[PDB]
């Protein structure tokens, strides 16, 4: 019938839009994990540096 | 065939769109907030 056409113009948009917004809610969240990981990768190198420098200084000093 | 078929069907097609737009924004919303709170845990942890 004619009401069955109407349910199909909607039922198409409301999956196109909600599939799109579940891949932005994916995407932001993927970059959020890859940032936190990298802000701790730079933190890891820094600490190392400070320890290699530190020990050399105490060897020289002594 | 009455006009009531398409009339009272149209005013449901509009509700189906509205929930679509809602729960699109209310989903991305969650992710943006969750991205902030995650990177706070990454600062809180990192300085300590």
From Swiss-Prot, chain A:
Q: Which residues of the full protein are shown?
A: 3 to 64 of 188
Q: Which family does it belong to?
A: Belongs to the V-ATPase E subunit family.
Domain of life of the native organism: Bacteria
Role description: Produces ATP from ADP in the presence of a proton gradient across the membrane.
UniProt name for this protein: V-type ATP synthase subunit E
Say which species the protein is native to: Thermus thermophilus (strain ATCC 27634 / DSM 579 / HB8)
């Amino acid at each position: 019938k004619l009401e069955a056409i109407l349910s199909q113009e909607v039922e198409a948009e409301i999956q196109a839009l909600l599939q799109e917004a579940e891949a932005k809610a994916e995407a932001v969240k993927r970059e959020a994990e890859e940032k936190a990981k990298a802000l701790l990768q730079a933190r890891e190198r820094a600490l190392e540096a400070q320890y290699r420098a530190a020990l050399r200084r105490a060897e020289s000093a002594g | 065939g009455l006009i009531k078929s398409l009339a009272e069907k149209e005013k449901q097609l509009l509700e189906r769109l509205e929930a679509a737009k809602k729960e699109a924004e209310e989903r991305v919303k969650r992710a943006e907030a969750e991205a902030k709170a995650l990177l706070e845990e990454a600062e809180a942890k990192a300085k300590a």
